């Protein structure tokens, strides 16, 4: 409707297996440009599937989904492709010195890059350096956030991070660096929900809560 509405779901139901259990049932939300939507809920609630729908990997059986522009997705499982740290961050996107430095900093990769003699030109892989789980999760988040997009779909990017690093990156990256970007963050932490403009709590594909942090706290 309005140019400032980034993503809308109206009366959305969807199925992974035709004739089976709906993975999402009667979903409704509207996200304005620059807002942070937190998507909470237990294992199997339909959180990753909700992102998949936005990405066109799962079409709804009913209802309407609309999103403006380009998406950048961060998978709940971190990954790399054999190559340099720098290529693992920027591949497929033009180099921009400032953005690059700001992303490395916000994702706490500055320190790790400085330990190598080849710095961000260090080759990742069996035959080079093997990143730890934590390093791989930070580089996967940096890859997603570096890309210029109208909508960032961050699927539990801190699931494999320690809580001290998670707090720092949630604050420096998701809240500060990305302050005016449209973000859908899959997280069930109260520490994160506190900062969201809107919250969707999914339970077995259904919307158990949709509203502000004040409305949630009141419940």
């Amino acid at each position, epitope marked *: 409707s309005l140019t400032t509405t980034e993503v809308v779901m109206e009366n959305v139901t969807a199925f992974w297996e035709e004739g089976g259990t709906p993975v999402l049932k009667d979903i409704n939300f509207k996200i304005e440009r620059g807002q942070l939507l937190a998507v909470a809920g237990s294992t199997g609630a339909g959180k990753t599937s909700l992102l998949m729908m936005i*990405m066109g990997e799962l079409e709804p059986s009913e209802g309407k989904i609309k999103h403006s522009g380009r998406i950048s997705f961060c998978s709940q499982f971190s990954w790399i492709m*054999p190559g340099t740290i720098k290529e693992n961050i920027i591949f*497929g996107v033009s180099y921009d010195e400032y953005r690059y430095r700001s992303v490395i900093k916000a994702c706490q990769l500055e320190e790790d890059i400085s330990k190598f003699a080849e710095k961000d030109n260090i080759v990742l892989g069996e035959g080079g350096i093997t990143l730890s789980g934590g390093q791989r999760a930070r580089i996967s988040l940096a890859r997603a956030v570096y890309k210029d997009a109208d909508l960032y779909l961050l699927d539990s990017p801190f699931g494999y991070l320690d809580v001290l690093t998670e707090k720092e990156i949630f604050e420096s990256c998701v809240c500060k660096l990305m302050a005016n970007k449209t973000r859908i963050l899959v997280t069930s932490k109260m520490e994160h929900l506190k900062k969201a403009d809107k919250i969707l709590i999914l339970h077995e594909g259904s919307s158990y809560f949709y509203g502000t942090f004040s409305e949630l706290q009141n419940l």
Partner: nanobody
Amino acid sequence: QVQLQESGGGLVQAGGSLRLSCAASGSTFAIIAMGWYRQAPGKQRELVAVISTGDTRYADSVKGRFTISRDNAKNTVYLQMDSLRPEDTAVYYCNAAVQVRDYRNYWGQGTQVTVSS
């Protein structure tokens, strides 16, 4: 814990098309991301396309011509190569980022793509 096998490579004239496929097999595995690389003799392997889940990236040299896609039910990735040029001549490899209880990447053994003038 995973084996990758490419197919679809061969001889084609400039302007023509080719569809590369990469089949992952094994027993217990979850593919996180799949990439396509190309290697000219005596040179480094060059990443040309990568797909995680519905998020794709391309090397500048291949944009608008190559398309990476997945058959999620089948553990396969494809590289649709259109408007092929002689400089696309190389061995093409697929690479899979996988969870087999620990994180690992696996290489395929490659498929020759030869583009004539």
